[PDB]
């Protein structure tokens, strides 16, 4: 793998809060979108050079947002660009066929109904339903085609700093600042699972030791961006705390579909707290297996993902216990978001210092892709 840190500020040296690749791309060159405090959403063209170093070409600037833009997400088909910010309105952009722009984008829908800043957005697999988390203690589901609000979850007691949508279309997961993880049934439209506390083994002298799983306001990141696994089997939630002895350690919790009220395991991250989790959309063939009960889940394939903390990025896969990659100390301030490219050749990392970086992988470095992507057992 290679690391290319960009020495030129994309958003006038203002913090960059979000990143997302155009998932609809099927070739070798990719489209990337960045949101910043400069009230702009910038779309760039990313491709590898002859040597293998990533190169960024500026394509367009979208300045319709009035305040800082906190989240940018592409629809699964890559056709609709969702952008949310401090103005409590989510803009849906599309390519329409403004001097600085090589290509032009225009707003199709202005999703309204939030009262404060929008921090995270998650699309559904079909692309017709959207979910967003905001400062106003509510997570709102949206009819993308209708362009209207369909459901509001106000069970939160603080800011909602992350939302993920089940690829099997059964659950929607929200991570809030009240140290509480909530899982809502997509059909019942109510709270299905509530996960805040964790029993700490056996307490000393027979005590019932229970501690809060997630971090308090000391979190330096606005975001607690958890994510589902592309197959749906696992749910990865950052900003977690584990009390090994008398000290607390930052970690990312891993939950299974079988039971969502207790994690299978936790990936420990000594140092800073983990804030983002993003999965590679490519299913990989299993490595030559040294037979052990190490795998997080036992399926014929495996999935590579990345966990971004305040100052580091850890690169895990499904079957190994330890991460196969680690990068750190490439940015002078807290990281904000991570996004994989469609082919898995790129991992874009954004940080609040104003500069972004890329982690590039050469041909088949992450693994051997499956001949056919497995069919999903969607619930609906």
């Amino acid at each position: 793998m290679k690391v290319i840190t960009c020495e030129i500020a994309w958003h006038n040296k203002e913090p960059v809060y979000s990143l997302d690749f155009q998932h609809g791309t099927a070739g070798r060159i990719h489209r990337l979108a960045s949101a910043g405090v400069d009230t702009n959403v910038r779309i760039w063209k990313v491709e590898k050079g002859p040597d293998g170093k990533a190169i960024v070409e500026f394509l367009s600037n979208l300045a319709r947002h009035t305040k800082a833009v906190n989240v940018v997400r592409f629809s699964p088909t890559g056709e609709i660009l969702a952008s949310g910010g401090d103005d409590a309105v989510i803009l849906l952009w599309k390519v329409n066929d403004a001097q600085l722009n090589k290509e032009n984008w225009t707003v199709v829908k202005t999703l309204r109904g939030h009262l404060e800043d929008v921090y995270d957005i998650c699309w559904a697999t079909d692309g017709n339903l959207m979910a967003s988390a905001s400062v106003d203690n509510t997570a709102i589901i949206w009819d993308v085609s209708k362009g209207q609000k369909i459901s509001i979850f106000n069970e939160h007691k603080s800011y909602v700093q992350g939302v993920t949508w089940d690829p099997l279309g059964q659950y929607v997961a929200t991570l809030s600042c009240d140290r509480v993880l909530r899982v809502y049934s997509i059909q019942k439209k109510r709270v299905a699972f509530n996960v805040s506390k964790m029993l700490s083994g056996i307490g000393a002298e027979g005590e019932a030791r229970s501690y809060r799983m997630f971090h308090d306001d000391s979190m330096k990141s606005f975001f607690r961006r958890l994510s589902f696994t592309p197959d749906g089997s696992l749910l990865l939630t950052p900003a977690g705390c584990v009390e090994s002895g008398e000290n607390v350690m930052n970690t990312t919790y891993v939950f299974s579909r079988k039971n969502l009220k207790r994690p299978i395991a936790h990936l420990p991250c000594p140092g800073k707290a983990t804030l983002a989790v993003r999965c590679c959309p490519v299913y990989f063939e299993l490595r030559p297996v040294v037979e052990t009960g190490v795998e997080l889940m036992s399926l014929p394939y495996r999935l590579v993902f990345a966990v971004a903390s305040e100052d580091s990025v850890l690169l895990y896969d499904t079957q190994q216990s330890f991460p196969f990659g680690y990068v750190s100390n490439i940015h002078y301030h807290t990281l904000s978001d991570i996004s994989w490219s469609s082919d898995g050749a790129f991992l874009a990392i954004s940080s609040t210092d104003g500069y972004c970086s890329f982690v590039t992988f050469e041909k088949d470095e992450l693994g051997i892709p499956l001949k056919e992507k497995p069919v999903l057992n969607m619930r609906t």
């Binding site: 020495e7 891993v254 936790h266 991250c269 490595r287 190994q320 196969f324 680690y326 990068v327 100390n329």
Partner: protein
């Protein structure tokens, strides 16, 4: 300017040619010279005029090509640390280079501030004892950071406590790899997952 069957001289990318003339062109000069060549009048004494004016000199050859030397600096130097308090370099003069073919000891590249009154340019072999022992010399043989624009901005934000980042990347290390370094394997084992049953 091809002379005969020879191609003209090719000036390379970073070449400089010493000037062919050392005086501005005077048109009548040659004609006057011819007159002064025939007259043979002992009126003019050149050595007399030499002491009555300044000697005609010229400097080292410099580059004068159009758009020749144009550069950009993307770095600002920030110096931190007391250092050893070494004296001012300016008062030590030019660094002399003394290298000899027959010397096993490498070339000398350094200043020389020893002072004598007997080692003159008029007499190279003039000895100066009691200051230089005349025996064979070759018997046998804090921080100055160069910040970039991003690091300069971060330094202005933080101050002298700021230090440049040292990126730490660990390559792809798998459980199946056999020749992979064990140090990277243990550093990644520091992040090994912990399971709850």
């Amino acid at each position: 300017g091809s002379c005969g069957k020879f191609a003209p001289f090719e000036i390379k990318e970073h070449m400089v040619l010493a000037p062919r003339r050392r005086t501005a062109f005077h048109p009548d000069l040659c004609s006057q010279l011819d007159q002064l060549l025939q007259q043979q009048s002992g009126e003019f004494s050149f050595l007399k005029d030499l002491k009555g004016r300044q000697p005609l000199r010229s400097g080292p050859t410099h580059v004068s090509t159009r758009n020749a030397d144009i550069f950009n600096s993307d770095v600002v130097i920030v110096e931190r640390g007391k250092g050893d308090g070494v004296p001012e370099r300016r008062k030590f003069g030019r660094m002399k280079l003394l290298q000899f073919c027959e010397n096993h000891r490498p070339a000398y590249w350094g200043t020389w501030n020893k002072k004598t009154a007997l080692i003159r340019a008029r007499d190279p072999w003039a000895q100066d004892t009691k200051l230089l022992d005349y025996e064979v010399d070759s018997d046998e043989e804090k921080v100055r950071q160069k910040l970039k624009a991003k690091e300069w901005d971060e330094f202005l934000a933080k101050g002298k406590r700021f230090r440049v980042l040292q990126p730490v990347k660990i390559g792809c290390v798998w459980a199946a790899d056999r020749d992979c370094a064990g140090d990277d394997l243990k550093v990644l084992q520091q992040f090994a997952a912990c399971f709850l049953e």
